[PDB]
Amino acid sequence: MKKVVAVVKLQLPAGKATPAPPVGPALGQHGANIMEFVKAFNAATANMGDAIVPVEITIYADRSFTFVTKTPPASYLIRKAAGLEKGAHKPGREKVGRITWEQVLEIAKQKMPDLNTTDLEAAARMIAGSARSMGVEVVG
Amino acid sequence: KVRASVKRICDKCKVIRRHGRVYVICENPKHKQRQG
Amino acid sequence: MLMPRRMKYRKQQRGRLKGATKGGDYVAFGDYGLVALEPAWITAQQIEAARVAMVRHFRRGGKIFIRIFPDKPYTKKPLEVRMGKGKGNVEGYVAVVKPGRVMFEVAGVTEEQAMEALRIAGHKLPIKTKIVRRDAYDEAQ
Amino acid sequence: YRLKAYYREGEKPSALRRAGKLPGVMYNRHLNRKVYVDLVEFDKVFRQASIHHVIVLELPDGQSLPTLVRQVNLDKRRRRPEHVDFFVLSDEPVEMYVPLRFVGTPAGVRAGGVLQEIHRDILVKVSPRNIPEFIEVDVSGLEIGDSLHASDLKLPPGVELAVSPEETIAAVVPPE
Amino acid sequence: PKGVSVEVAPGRVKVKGPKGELEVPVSPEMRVVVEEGVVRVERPSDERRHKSLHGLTRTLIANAVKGVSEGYSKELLIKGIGYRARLVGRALELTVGFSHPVVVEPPEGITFEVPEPTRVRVSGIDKQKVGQVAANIRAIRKPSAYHEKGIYYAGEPVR
RNA sequence: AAGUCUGGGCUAAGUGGUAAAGGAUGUGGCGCGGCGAAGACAGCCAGGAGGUUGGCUUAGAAGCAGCCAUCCUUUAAAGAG
RNA sequence: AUGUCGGCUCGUCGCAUCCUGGGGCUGAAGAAGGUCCCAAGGGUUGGGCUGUUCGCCCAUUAAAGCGGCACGCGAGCUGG
Ligand SMILES: [Mg+2]
Ligand SMILES: [Mg+2]
Ligand SMILES: [Mg+2]
Ligand SMILES: [Mg+2]
Ligand SMILES: [Mg+2]
Ligand SMILES: [Mg+2]
Ligand SMILES: [Mg+2]
Ligand SMILES: [Mg+2]
Ligand SMILES: [Mg+2]
Ligand SMILES: [Mg+2]
Ligand SMILES: [Mg+2]
Ligand SMILES: [Mg+2]
Ligand SMILES: [Mg+2]
Ligand SMILES: [Mg+2]
Ligand SMILES: [Zn+2]
Numbered sequence: 001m002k003k004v005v006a007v008v009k010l011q012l013p014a015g016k017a018t019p020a021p022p023v024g025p026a027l028g029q030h031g032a033n034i035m036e037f038v039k040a041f042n043a044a045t046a047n048m049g050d051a052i053v054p055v056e057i058t059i060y061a062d063r064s065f066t067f068v069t070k071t072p073p074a075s076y077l078i079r080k081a082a083g084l085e086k087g088a089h090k091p092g093r094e095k096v097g098r099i100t101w102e103q104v105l106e107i108a109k110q111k112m113p114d115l116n117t118t119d120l121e122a123a124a125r126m127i128a129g130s131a132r133s134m135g136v137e138v139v140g
Numbered sequence: 141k142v143r144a145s146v147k148r149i150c151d152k153c154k155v156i157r158r159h160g161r162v163y164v165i166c167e168n169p170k171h172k173q174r175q176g
Numbered sequence: 177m178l179m180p181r182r183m184k185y186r187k188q189q190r191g192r193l194k195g196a197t198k199g200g201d202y203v204a205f206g207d208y209g210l211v212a213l214e215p216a217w218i219t220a221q222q223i224e225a226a227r228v229a230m231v232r233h234f235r236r237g238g239k240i241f242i243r244i245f246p247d248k249p250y251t252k253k254p255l256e257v258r259m260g261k262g263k264g265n266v267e268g269y270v271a272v273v274k275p276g277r278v279m280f281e282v283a284g285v286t287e288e289q290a291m292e293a294l295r296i297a298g299h300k301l302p303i304k305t306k307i308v309r310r311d312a313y314d315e316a317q
Numbered sequence: 318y319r320l321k322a323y324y325r326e327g328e329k330p331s332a333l334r335r336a337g338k339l340p341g342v343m344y345n346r347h348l349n350r351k352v353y354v355d356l357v358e359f360d361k362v363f364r365q366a367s368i369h370h371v372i373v374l375e376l377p378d379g380q381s382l383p384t385l386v387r388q389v390n391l392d393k394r395r396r397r398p399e400h401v402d403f404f405v406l407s408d409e410p411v412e413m414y415v416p417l418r419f420v421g422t423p424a425g426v427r428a429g430g431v432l433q434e435i436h437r438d439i440l441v442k443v444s445p446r447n448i449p450e451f452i453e454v455d456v457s458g459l460e461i462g463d464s465l466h467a468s469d470l471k472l473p474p475g476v477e478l479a480v481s482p483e484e485t486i487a488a489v490v491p492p493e
Numbered sequence: 494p495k496g497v498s499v500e501v502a503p504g505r506v507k508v509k510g511p512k513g514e515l516e517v518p519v520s521p522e523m524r525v526v527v528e529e530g531v532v533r534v535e536r537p538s539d540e541r542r543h544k545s546l547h548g549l550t551r552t553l554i555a556n557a558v559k560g561v562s563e564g565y566s567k568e569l570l571i572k573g574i575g576y577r578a579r580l581v582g583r584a585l586e587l588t589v590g591f592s593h594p595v596v597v598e599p600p601e602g603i604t605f606e607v608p609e610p611t612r613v614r615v616s617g618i619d620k621q622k623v624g625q626v627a628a629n630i631r632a633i634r635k636p637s638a639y640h641e642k643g644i645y646y647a648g649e650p651v652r
Numbered sequence: 653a654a655g656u657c658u659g660g661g662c663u664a665a666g667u668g669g670u671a672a673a674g675g676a677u678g679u680g681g682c683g684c685g686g687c688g689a690a691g692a693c694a695g696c697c698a699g700g701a702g703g704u705u706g707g708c709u710u711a712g713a714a715g716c717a718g719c720c721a722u723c724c725u726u727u728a729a730a731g732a733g
Numbered sequence: 734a735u736g737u738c739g740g741c742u743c744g745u746c747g748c749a750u751c752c753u754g755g756g757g758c759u760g761a762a763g764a765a766g767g768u769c770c771c772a773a774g775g776g777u778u779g780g781g782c783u784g785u786u787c788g789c790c791c792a793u794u795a796a797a798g799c800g801g802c803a804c805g806c807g808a809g810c811u812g813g
Contacts, residue, residue: 074703087707090720093427116702116726126703129723134707141758141769145675162676169758201393231493239431239490276394284431312389312398316414316438317368639762
């Protein structure tokens with residue numbers, strides 16, 4: 001969310017990356033290197049962890065780019081936080097699993113550098129809501 | 141096109157009334173309605 | 177569809193329709209309702225064909241109240257048969273309806289979906305209808 | 318609220334409405350009189366008023382009488398009023414219907430269900446000094462198949478029930 | 494409003510300026526003369542028919558004013574391959590598609606313009622008389638076939 | 653044969669001079685509400701964001717096929733459109 | 734005592750148009766079509782089978798329209 005010029009955001013997992021399905025054409029269509037990225041990516045994925053890093057890549061004529069990495073979707077940190085494979089299909093009523101007023105706060109700390117709300121109650125909120133977003137009631 | 145109940149189909153369509161006849165004009169010709 | 181499962185007599189006289197409902201002028205069930213303006217016999221086929229028109233419109237939503245019931249046997253003589261020789265046989269069933277009768281009424285839905293799920297049903301009826309929302313008459317003090 | 322009432326000696330009810338005067342009548346153990354409150358005013362008033370709250374009759378001769386509408390009569394077709402007649406208030410065990418604000422948004426959510434507000438209010442013994450505006454029924458522990466009703470409300474000081482009670486004051490039912 | 498004479502006959506209000514005189518068959522209703530250093534326009538009770546007339550006259554004469562303040566404008570394109578009509582004197586000359594070539598015509602009171610064969614606008618002193626010649630030439634060739642050439646205005650092309 | 657009689661209205665279709673559901677910014681008269689000089693309607697310039705591509709399913713479903721929810725964020729304001 | 738089918742002859746009117754003339758949509762590239770609108774001026778073939786109307790078929794055509802006229806027409810014919 002800065003400048004724009006044929007950009008193409010997209011999420012990616014651990015070291016695993018290159019299959020055309022997830023990425024592949026994902027950036028090769030806008031003329032680019034699946035080479036200068038398949039590894040260039042696993043240069044920072046292998047370092048931080050092995051989850052799901054939302055990396056939005058911009059593109060120029062020199063099949064160049066600026067793959068900016070961010071914190072995994074607030075939807076991931078919330079899952080494993082209660083041990084849930086999928087989401088829940090139909091939220092708002094069935095709480096497959098649940099999280100506590102604190103477990104939510106933890107994550108909030110992990111994504112506060114991405115948001116735009118220093119406060120830890122403000123952030124935790126747009127997370128406690130992410131629960132009603134996948135059927136995972138908040139403990140409190 | 142031509143019919144008994146001529147109504148609106150867009151946010152872009154005027155209920156023009158020319159010649160005693162209630163027409164309907166929109167950007168896309170598919171919405172050109174008249175009454176008869 | 178929707179007919180009684182009894183009645184003491186299989187066929188009954190045509191009767192007459194002198195305006196003003198005998199009752200059911202006020203809405204005593206749901207939020208918004210549908211009221212008849214002109215007298216007429218509504219058919220079983222029509223009532224149903226509007227009850228679904230209703231739901232289908234707002235699929236998996238509120239509750240619909242049907243307040244008219246076709247308990248009048250409607251008859252008709254076969255085709256190409258001449259006058260006389262006994263009364264025709266039952267065709268289907270109708271419900272008498274005079275001006276002012278709140279036929280239908282929906283509950284637990286937005287006025288957005290009310291004054292629409294009704295506007296549609298209205299087109300399925302042989303008469304003119306008007307929409308209303310709970311007001312003057314209520315059962316209290 | 319207040320509303321300008323007047324007196325009817327015996328002038329054609331038809332001619333009354335024709336002018337705009339919806340007729341009515343205040344009665345009770347004592348006074349029994351013909352009146353003719355304006356219609357538009359009355360509507361505008363009784364509109365949000367209902368038989369739920371009291372009215373003050375500002376007659377043509379000082380007297381400012383209390384009032385608790387007893388029944389508005391309709392025209393059937395053209396559901397409009399013909400005879401709005403209000404009960405004159407004393408301070409006796411005046412029976413009346415107290416509203417019923419539920420609030421709580423019970424079960425029946427993703428599942429759907431509907432708030433069958435059966436009986437949007439209820440009758441009870443009280444005194445004019447006590448006009449118990451509303452009553453409570455949160456219901457959010459009651460799902461679909463279930464339903465509260467009888468003795469399930471809270472009777473504040475000066476408000477007793479006139480039932481049994483079994484009147485299923487509300488319930489929840491399935492969608493479509 | 495500038496070098497303009499606001500005549501005021503029955504409905505006639507012809508105006509003269511740097512280029513020419515322009516009569517404006519106005520509806521003999523409510524009446525309004527050169528009155529003051531500018532022009533006014535009044536009307537009777539708020540009657541739909543009067544509501545319209547007032548205004549219909551109002552903006553009609555103001556177009557008449559600019560009748561000599563120059564109201565030329567009205568420019569056209571041509572796009573496409575062999576599409577690019579040029580000029581042939583104070584007269585135009587179109588050439589696009591048709592197996593057999595086709596001219597135009599002398600519109601007494603209007604001048605043409607071909608500042609490039611791929612551009613043509615019209616010099617107008619009137620108005621509805623110019624907007625007419627527009628469509629008129631505009632319609633010599635219809636734009637599209639799902640897409641491509643044809644004559645245009647200044648608007649936008651369809652897909 | 654006898655008023656181109658007299659006041660006050662409505663109608664612009666030859667309606668009048670024979671039709672319905674249903675359509676429509678056709679006109680006229682009473683009304684009800686809603687915003688408005690703590691500056692409204694249209695307008696023209698500005699923004700129209702973020703968690704997040706909400707969860708499911710799908711090749712894909714990123715507000716924007718369908719299904720569920722519809723909480724919360726930083727704001728002058730931004731619907732999980 | 735108002736002669737009843739089909740054919741033949743002679744037509745004429747309607748439009749709810751089968752051609753041909755105009756025109757809006759199109760999931761209209763073009764040529765072809767589809768659908769609705771306007772529009773009878775004029776056109777709307779020859780045969781095989783059956784009493785047939787109706788139909789099916791052969792060979793074409795721009796098209797081989799649907800009706801009303803006492804299901805037009807026996808003081809005009811035929812009479813299967
Ligand atoms: Mg049953
Ligand atoms: Mg009667
Ligand atoms: Mg095309
Ligand atoms: Mg005479
Ligand atoms: Mg009519
Ligand atoms: Mg004879
Ligand atoms: Mg026609
Ligand atoms: Mg073509
Ligand atoms: Mg032959
Ligand atoms: Mg033979
Ligand atoms: Mg014929
Ligand atoms: Mg015959
Ligand atoms: Mg014989
Ligand atoms: Mg013989
Ligand atoms: Zn439109």
